[PDB]
């Protein structure tokens with residue numbers, strides 16, 4: 495009430511603070527008003543994941559044979575069955591292929607199948623901004639992921655202005671780069687409104703367009719792979735050839751559910767509890783979103799889709815956590831989607847459940863701890879409020895958005911849950927002053 499005055503009038507605050515297990519809140523300010531959660535969405539994802547999949551779930555990738563092996567020759571298909579493992583690396587594919595060879599397969603009399611049947615429909619959630627789709631933080635969290643589905647490129651201006659700027663990319667990235675970038679003389683009138691753009695095409699083609707001012711060093715750029723299956727296929731095909739394995743057929747995608755072949759090689763991710771800790775400490779969208787469609791797959795035994803994920807999380811929260819989210823909209827796991835819409839009061843029910851079951855979930859220890867390595871290592875409001883070491887909370891940050899959801903231990907040692915949904919802060923002083931006062935008050939007055 496007094497605090498709100500610290501913020502620009504352009505800003506929208508919805509805030510709830512409640513003692514763990516209490517029937518009534520200590521602070522309740524527009525707590526039923528629905529807001530964009532951004533990355534605080536990951537709290538709900540983590541909880542739904544632990545309940546549905548459990549802390550010991552591991553993502554799985556396999557090479558399977560369908561057919562008889564005669565004289566080093568597979569009579570049939572090689573199936574590379576991807577499982578949305580966010581942490582799969584090129585070297586892992588190389589290792590599985592080394593294992594395939596070692597098992598006695600030198601030749602495939604058949605097709606190489608890139609099986610993505612674990613998932614179906616689009617690899618991008620509803621409500622994701624189109625313009626972010628080429629950025630690594632928003633890379634499609636496909637069934638087929640290798641080195642996070644992100645690659646990097648160097649863009650060099652041409653020595654003579656008007657000449658085409660040129661692109662260097664490492665041999666080990668199966669992408670196709672084209673440049674239509676005009677190098678501008680220093681001081682060109684064109685430089686103010688001529689954009690430098692990336693335009694993705696089919697089969698992991700990328701075209702760079704527009705203008706680049708003459709510059710002395712290359713411009714480093716990182717892009718998201720748009721077609722994870724094709725990318726993973728191309729890497730597998732490279733690794734097969736290097737290991738001297740030949741095949742007569744072609745690389746085909748397999749999207750339809752099917753019975754597994756004989757598993758000849760496999761890679762499993764770290765256990766889910768480990769991945770959810772990375773996810774919560776780093777706000778890792780890819781772990782959040784692979785987990786999210788995995789939940790739907792697991793709950794309903796269908797290829798995982800965004801809709802299946804949303805229905806499953808809603809159900810898990812209602813039936814296992816006794817939280818009816820009502821009119822909340824859950825669109826993804828990471829909070830990237832602009833369709834995600836939730837009130838502090840609803841997220842409070844989620845936090846209350848977590849605090850009440852924390853000896854079981856080992857959840858709170860996974861959230862960023864204020865003043866320690868993580869997203870809250872130094873958040874000036876919290877530091878100045880004197881609450882380093884006292885707040886465990888998930889951030890949700892965007893231009894003009896400063897969300898915080900989690901727990902604080904007060905001066906008297908009571909634990910309080912809080913949801914701070916604060917947006918349109920297009921107007922780092924008013925925010926600091928608000929949070930310094932607010933968290934200082936909660937800590938010392940409870």
Ligand SMILES: *C(=O)[C@@H](NC(=O)/C(=C\CC)c1csc(N)n1)[C@@H]1NC(C(=O)OCOC(=O)C(C)(C)C)=C(COC(N)=O)CS1
Pocket residue numbers: 532533534631776777778779828829830831832869870889890891892
């Ligand atoms: C959580 O909010 C995540 N990002 C988003 O949700 C975004 C939009 C959702 C509506 C978003 C749009 S554009 C963009 N880059 N993200 C993840 N959160 C963060 C992060 O912590 O926020 C950045 O600000 C901070 O670093 C502090 C919170 C001040 C510490 C991640 C870091 O950003 C990356 N790209 O450097 C991962 S994305």
